[PDB]
Protein backbone atom coordinates (compact mmCIF):
# COMPACT_ATOMS: atom_id res chain seq x y z
CA UNK A 1 0.00 0.00 0.00
CA UNK A 2 1.04 3.56 -0.85
CA UNK A 3 1.62 6.22 1.78
CA UNK A 4 -0.89 9.07 1.51
CA UNK A 5 0.18 11.79 3.92
CA UNK A 6 -1.16 15.35 3.84
CA UNK A 7 1.45 18.09 3.36
CA UNK A 8 -0.55 20.32 5.71
CA UNK A 9 -1.58 19.66 9.29
CA UNK A 10 -5.19 19.29 10.44
CA UNK A 11 -5.34 22.74 12.01
CA UNK A 12 -6.82 25.31 9.64
CA UNK A 13 -4.45 28.27 9.17
CA UNK A 14 -1.61 26.69 11.09
CA UNK A 15 0.96 29.05 12.58
CA UNK A 16 4.16 29.63 10.61
CA UNK A 17 6.00 27.56 13.21
CA UNK A 18 3.50 24.69 13.02
CA UNK A 19 3.72 24.76 9.22
CA UNK A 20 7.50 24.52 9.43
CA UNK A 21 7.45 21.77 12.07
CA UNK A 22 4.88 19.65 10.22
CA UNK A 23 6.74 20.07 6.93
CA UNK A 24 9.97 19.06 8.60
CA UNK A 25 8.28 15.90 9.85
CA UNK A 26 6.72 15.09 6.44
CA UNK A 27 9.95 15.73 4.53
CA UNK A 28 12.12 13.63 6.85
CA UNK A 29 9.63 10.81 7.46
CA UNK A 30 10.97 7.55 5.99
CA UNK A 31 14.43 9.03 5.32
CA UNK A 32 15.66 9.94 8.80
CA UNK A 33 14.70 9.31 12.44
CA UNK A 34 14.44 12.21 14.87
CA UNK A 35 16.15 11.65 18.23
CA UNK A 36 14.24 12.57 21.42
CA UNK A 37 14.30 12.34 25.20
CA UNK A 38 11.73 12.85 27.94
CA UNK A 39 12.44 15.06 30.93
CA UNK A 40 10.97 15.03 34.48
CA UNK A 41 8.82 17.99 35.49
CA UNK A 42 8.36 18.87 39.14
CA UNK A 43 10.30 20.79 41.78
CA UNK A 44 13.83 20.10 40.41
CA UNK A 45 15.04 23.03 38.23
CA UNK A 46 18.37 21.23 37.49
CA UNK A 47 16.55 18.23 36.11
CA UNK A 48 14.74 20.13 33.45
CA UNK A 49 17.40 19.42 30.80
CA UNK A 50 19.10 16.49 32.47
CA UNK A 51 18.59 13.91 29.69
CA UNK A 52 19.46 16.22 26.76
CA UNK A 53 22.54 17.50 28.62
CA UNK A 54 23.71 13.95 29.35
CA UNK A 55 23.33 13.12 25.70
CA UNK A 56 25.34 16.18 24.63
CA UNK A 57 28.23 15.36 26.95
CA UNK A 58 28.26 11.58 26.48
CA UNK A 59 27.13 11.06 22.91
CA UNK A 60 28.22 14.36 21.40
CA UNK A 61 24.78 15.78 20.51
CA UNK A 62 21.51 16.84 22.10
CA UNK A 63 18.36 15.12 20.89
CA UNK A 64 16.32 17.08 18.39
CA UNK A 65 13.14 16.54 20.43
CA UNK A 66 12.52 17.11 24.15
CA UNK A 67 9.54 15.75 26.09
CA UNK A 68 7.63 17.81 28.65
CA UNK A 69 4.50 17.04 30.74
CA UNK A 70 1.77 19.32 32.19
CA UNK A 71 1.06 16.75 34.98
CA UNK A 72 1.59 19.25 37.84
CA UNK A 73 -0.03 22.22 36.13
CA UNK A 74 -3.44 21.29 37.58
CA UNK A 75 -4.62 19.02 40.33
CA UNK A 76 -5.48 18.50 43.96
CA UNK A 77 -2.60 19.59 46.15
CA UNK A 78 -0.42 20.76 43.21
CA UNK A 79 -0.41 24.45 44.26
CA UNK A 80 3.25 24.11 45.25
CA UNK A 81 3.92 23.81 41.50
CA UNK A 82 1.29 25.80 39.61
CA UNK A 83 1.35 28.74 42.05
CA UNK A 84 5.11 28.94 42.41
CA UNK A 85 6.96 31.23 40.00
CA UNK A 86 9.88 28.72 39.95
CA UNK A 87 7.59 26.02 38.38
CA UNK A 88 4.35 27.50 37.02
CA UNK A 89 6.15 28.29 33.70
CA UNK A 90 8.45 25.32 33.73
CA UNK A 91 6.75 23.64 30.74
CA UNK A 92 6.36 26.84 28.70
CA UNK A 93 9.95 27.85 29.37
CA UNK A 94 11.36 24.43 28.61
CA UNK A 95 9.45 24.35 25.32
CA UNK A 96 10.45 27.94 24.42
CA UNK A 97 14.08 27.20 25.21
CA UNK A 98 14.24 24.06 23.08
CA UNK A 99 12.32 25.64 20.18
CA UNK A 100 14.65 28.65 20.25
CA UNK A 101 17.60 26.27 19.82
CA UNK A 102 15.90 24.73 16.78
CA UNK A 103 14.50 21.66 18.59
CA UNK A 104 11.06 20.13 18.81
CA UNK A 105 9.03 20.35 22.05
CA UNK A 106 6.82 17.27 22.50
CA UNK A 107 4.19 17.94 25.17
CA UNK A 108 1.89 15.52 26.96
CA UNK A 109 -0.29 15.72 30.05
CA UNK A 110 -0.84 13.10 32.74
CA UNK A 111 -4.10 14.83 33.59
CA UNK A 112 -4.90 14.60 37.30
CA UNK A 113 -8.49 13.95 38.45
CA UNK A 114 -10.37 17.02 37.27
CA UNK A 115 -12.81 16.75 40.22
CA UNK A 116 -9.88 17.38 42.56
CA UNK A 117 -11.26 14.62 44.85
CA UNK A 118 -7.89 12.85 44.39
CA UNK A 119 -4.61 13.83 42.72
CA UNK A 120 -4.63 10.67 40.54
CA UNK A 121 -4.62 10.13 36.81
CA UNK A 122 -4.55 6.33 37.13
CA UNK A 123 -7.85 4.50 36.71
CA UNK A 124 -9.52 1.81 38.84
CA UNK A 125 -8.11 -0.97 36.54
CA UNK A 126 -4.52 0.31 36.66
CA UNK A 127 -3.47 -1.43 39.87
CA UNK A 128 -2.36 1.95 41.25
CA UNK A 129 -4.00 4.52 43.53
CA UNK A 130 -6.91 5.63 41.37
CA UNK A 131 -9.38 8.30 40.54
CA UNK A 132 -13.09 7.58 40.15
CA UNK A 133 -13.47 10.44 37.66
CA UNK A 134 -15.95 9.29 34.97
CA UNK A 135 -15.05 10.16 31.36
CA UNK A 136 -18.57 9.32 30.16
CA UNK A 137 -19.91 12.06 32.42
CA UNK A 138 -17.11 14.48 31.50
CA UNK A 139 -18.18 14.54 27.85
CA UNK A 140 -21.85 15.36 28.63
CA UNK A 141 -22.62 19.07 28.66
CA UNK A 142 -23.59 20.55 32.04
CA UNK A 143 -22.36 17.79 34.37
CA UNK A 144 -19.98 18.55 37.21
CA UNK A 145 -17.35 16.49 35.38
CA UNK A 146 -17.80 18.52 32.19
CA UNK A 147 -17.37 21.77 34.07
CA UNK A 148 -14.21 20.36 35.71
CA UNK A 149 -12.53 19.30 32.47
CA UNK A 150 -13.29 22.66 30.88
CA UNK A 151 -11.70 24.49 33.82
CA UNK A 152 -8.52 22.42 33.48
CA UNK A 153 -8.49 22.77 29.69
CA UNK A 154 -8.58 26.56 30.07
CA UNK A 155 -5.43 26.42 32.27
CA UNK A 156 -3.51 24.28 29.81
CA UNK A 157 -4.75 26.39 26.88
CA UNK A 158 -3.38 29.47 28.66
CA UNK A 159 0.05 27.81 28.63
CA UNK A 160 -0.20 26.74 25.03
CA UNK A 161 -1.34 30.31 24.12
CA UNK A 162 1.83 31.68 25.75
CA UNK A 163 3.76 29.39 23.39
CA UNK A 164 1.60 30.40 20.42
CA UNK A 165 2.22 34.10 21.10
CA UNK A 166 5.99 33.41 21.31
CA UNK A 167 5.93 31.71 17.87
CA UNK A 168 6.53 28.24 19.35
CA UNK A 169 4.93 25.14 17.82
CA UNK A 170 4.76 21.81 19.58
CA UNK A 171 3.88 18.19 19.19
CA UNK A 172 0.79 17.86 21.40
CA UNK A 173 -0.03 14.31 22.55
CA UNK A 174 -3.10 14.46 24.79
CA UNK A 175 -5.21 11.65 26.17
CA UNK A 176 -2.40 9.22 25.55
CA UNK A 177 -2.36 5.43 25.99
CA UNK A 178 -6.16 5.55 26.13
CA UNK A 179 -6.58 1.98 24.92
CA UNK A 180 -4.75 0.56 27.95
CA UNK A 181 -7.62 1.87 30.12
CA UNK A 182 -5.15 2.55 32.94
CA UNK A 183 -5.78 6.33 32.79
CA UNK A 184 -9.19 7.83 33.52
CA UNK A 185 -9.56 9.23 29.97
CA UNK A 186 -9.52 5.77 28.42
CA UNK A 187 -11.06 3.83 31.30
CA UNK A 188 -14.61 4.09 29.88
CA UNK A 189 -13.53 2.98 26.40
CA UNK A 190 -13.43 4.39 22.93
CA UNK A 191 -16.66 6.32 22.93
CA UNK A 192 -15.75 8.68 25.76
CA UNK A 193 -12.18 8.96 24.49
CA UNK A 194 -13.25 10.17 21.07
CA UNK A 195 -15.78 12.61 22.61
CA UNK A 196 -13.06 13.94 24.94
CA UNK A 197 -10.68 14.36 22.02
CA UNK A 198 -13.30 16.37 20.13
CA UNK A 199 -14.06 18.56 23.13
CA UNK A 200 -10.37 19.35 23.58
CA UNK A 201 -9.64 19.74 19.85
CA UNK A 202 -12.52 22.12 19.34
CA UNK A 203 -11.80 24.10 22.49
CA UNK A 204 -8.10 24.47 21.69
CA UNK A 205 -8.22 24.92 17.94
CA UNK A 206 -11.53 26.79 17.48
CA UNK A 207 -12.42 28.50 20.74
CA UNK A 208 -8.86 29.37 21.80
CA UNK A 209 -7.35 29.63 18.27
CA UNK A 210 -4.37 27.51 19.23
CA UNK A 211 -3.04 27.04 15.72
CA UNK A 212 0.46 26.03 16.87
CA UNK A 213 -0.16 22.34 17.71
CA UNK A 214 0.70 19.17 15.82
CA UNK A 215 -1.71 16.55 17.19
CA UNK A 216 -0.33 13.13 18.15
CA UNK A 217 -2.75 10.21 18.71
CA UNK A 218 -1.19 7.40 20.75
CA UNK A 219 -2.35 4.13 19.15
CA UNK A 220 -1.01 1.62 21.70
CA UNK A 221 0.21 -0.50 23.20
CA UNK A 222 -2.27 -2.15 23.31
CA UNK A 223 -2.99 -1.75 19.60
CA UNK A 224 -5.79 -4.34 19.26
CA UNK A 225 -9.02 -2.67 18.17
CA UNK A 226 -7.44 0.79 18.04
CA UNK A 227 -9.39 1.73 14.87
CA UNK A 228 -12.47 2.18 17.06
CA UNK A 229 -10.56 4.61 19.32
CA UNK A 230 -9.28 6.80 16.45
CA UNK A 231 -10.53 10.39 16.57
CA UNK A 232 -10.35 10.64 12.75
CA UNK A 233 -8.03 11.99 10.09
CA UNK A 234 -9.28 15.55 10.63
CA UNK A 235 -8.22 15.61 14.31
CA UNK A 236 -4.82 13.81 14.22
CA UNK A 237 -1.49 14.65 12.56
CA UNK A 238 0.78 11.84 13.84
CA UNK A 239 0.27 8.30 15.08
CA UNK A 240 2.46 7.56 18.07
CA UNK A 241 3.25 4.20 19.68
CA UNK A 242 4.26 3.81 23.33
CA UNK A 243 6.15 0.48 23.29
CA UNK A 244 8.18 -0.71 26.25
CA UNK A 245 10.25 -3.69 25.10
CA UNK A 246 12.23 -5.95 27.37
CA UNK A 247 14.93 -3.90 29.09
CA UNK A 248 17.90 -3.76 26.72
CA UNK A 249 16.02 -4.93 23.61
CA UNK A 250 16.66 -2.55 20.68
CA UNK A 251 14.46 -4.47 18.23
CA UNK A 252 13.10 -2.12 15.62
CA UNK A 253 9.47 -2.99 16.39
CA UNK A 254 8.86 -3.42 12.67
CA UNK A 255 5.53 -5.14 13.12
CA UNK A 256 4.02 -2.31 15.16
CA UNK A 257 5.31 0.20 12.58
CA UNK A 258 3.63 -1.85 9.81
CA UNK A 259 0.41 -2.10 11.73
CA UNK A 260 0.27 1.64 12.19
CA UNK A 261 0.78 2.09 8.44
CA UNK A 262 -2.00 -0.46 7.65
CA UNK A 263 -4.57 0.51 10.29
CA UNK A 264 -4.40 4.21 9.44
CA UNK A 265 -4.24 3.58 5.70
CA UNK A 266 -0.89 5.29 5.28
CA UNK A 267 -2.50 8.67 5.97
CA UNK A 268 -0.41 9.74 8.97
CA UNK A 269 3.24 9.89 9.96
CA UNK A 270 4.11 7.14 12.47
CA UNK A 271 6.36 7.77 15.50
CA UNK A 272 7.61 6.02 18.65
CA UNK A 273 6.15 8.53 21.10
CA UNK A 274 7.44 6.62 24.17
CA UNK A 275 9.90 3.77 24.60
CA UNK A 276 12.36 2.23 26.98
CA UNK A 277 15.17 0.79 24.92
CA UNK A 278 15.24 2.79 21.67
CA UNK A 279 14.49 0.92 18.44
CA UNK A 280 17.64 0.53 16.33
CA UNK A 281 17.62 3.19 13.62
CA UNK A 282 16.51 1.34 10.47
CA UNK A 283 14.79 2.70 7.37
CA UNK A 284 12.70 -0.49 7.13
CA UNK A 285 10.98 0.67 10.40
CA UNK A 286 11.56 4.42 10.13
CA UNK A 287 9.85 5.85 13.21
CA UNK A 288 9.46 9.60 12.64
CA UNK A 289 10.92 10.20 16.07
CA UNK A 290 11.69 8.22 19.18
CA UNK A 291 11.49 9.33 22.84
CA UNK A 292 12.75 7.21 25.71
CA UNK A 293 11.25 7.96 29.09
CA UNK A 294 13.20 9.92 31.68
CA UNK A 295 15.84 8.94 34.24
CA UNK A 296 17.12 5.30 33.83
CA UNK A 297 15.08 4.76 30.62
CA UNK A 298 17.46 7.26 29.01
CA UNK A 299 20.59 7.71 31.14
CA UNK A 300 22.03 4.21 31.55
CA UNK A 301 22.14 2.44 34.90
CA UNK A 302 23.35 -1.03 35.82
CA UNK A 303 24.65 -3.95 33.81
CA UNK A 304 21.67 -4.22 31.41
CA UNK A 305 20.79 -0.56 30.81
CA UNK A 306 17.82 0.40 28.67
CA UNK A 307 20.07 2.54 26.45
CA UNK A 308 23.76 2.00 27.06
CA UNK A 309 26.49 4.57 26.56
CA UNK A 310 27.73 2.52 23.59
CA UNK A 311 24.22 2.43 22.07
CA UNK A 312 23.78 6.17 22.45
CA UNK A 313 27.17 7.00 20.94
CA UNK A 314 26.33 4.87 17.90
CA UNK A 315 22.79 6.18 17.58
CA UNK A 316 23.61 9.84 17.93
CA UNK A 317 26.39 9.61 15.30
CA UNK A 318 24.26 7.69 12.73
CA UNK A 319 23.58 9.35 9.39
CA UNK A 320 19.98 8.14 9.85
CA UNK A 321 19.44 10.13 13.02
CA UNK A 322 18.56 13.79 13.30
CA UNK A 323 20.08 15.45 16.41
CA UNK A 324 19.71 19.04 17.52
CA UNK A 325 22.81 19.88 15.48
CA UNK A 326 21.05 18.81 12.28
CA UNK A 327 18.04 21.09 12.80
CA UNK A 328 17.62 24.09 10.47
CA UNK A 329 16.32 26.63 13.01
CA UNK A 330 12.70 27.72 12.94
Ligand SMILES: *[C@@H]1O[C@H](CO)[C@@H](O)[C@H](O)[C@H]1NC(C)=O
Nearest residue numbers: 002003004005006233265267
Ligand atom coordinates in the same frame (compact mmCIF):
# COMPACT_ATOMS: atom_id res chain seq x y z
C1 LIG B 1 -5.70 9.94 0.58
O1 LIG B 1 -6.03 10.79 1.63
C2 LIG B 1 -7.04 11.74 1.30
C3 LIG B 1 -7.27 12.54 2.58
O2 LIG B 1 -7.58 11.66 3.65
C4 LIG B 1 -8.33 11.06 0.83
O3 LIG B 1 -9.18 12.00 0.22
C5 LIG B 1 -8.08 9.99 -0.22
O4 LIG B 1 -9.26 9.23 -0.35
C6 LIG B 1 -6.94 9.09 0.25
N1 LIG B 1 -6.62 8.02 -0.68
C7 LIG B 1 -5.98 8.24 -1.84
C8 LIG B 1 -5.69 7.04 -2.69
O5 LIG B 1 -5.63 9.35 -2.24
Ligand SMILES: [Mg+2]
Nearest residue numbers: 231232233234
Ligand atom coordinates in the same frame (compact mmCIF):
# COMPACT_ATOMS: atom_id res chain seq x y z
MG1 LIG C 1 -14.81 12.17 12.06
Ligand SMILES: [Mg+2]
Nearest residue numbers: 280281282283
Ligand atom coordinates in the same frame (compact mmCIF):
# COMPACT_ATOMS: atom_id res chain seq x y z
MG1 LIG D 1 19.70 -3.46 10.34
Ligand code: NA
Nearest residue numbers: 221222223224
Ligand atom coordinates in the same frame (compact mmCIF):
# COMPACT_ATOMS: atom_id res chain seq x y z
NA1 NA E 1 -0.15 -4.47 21.63
Ligand code: NA
Nearest residue numbers: 300305308309
Ligand atom coordinates in the same frame (compact mmCIF):
# COMPACT_ATOMS: atom_id res chain seq x y z
NA1 NA F 1 26.34 1.81 29.84
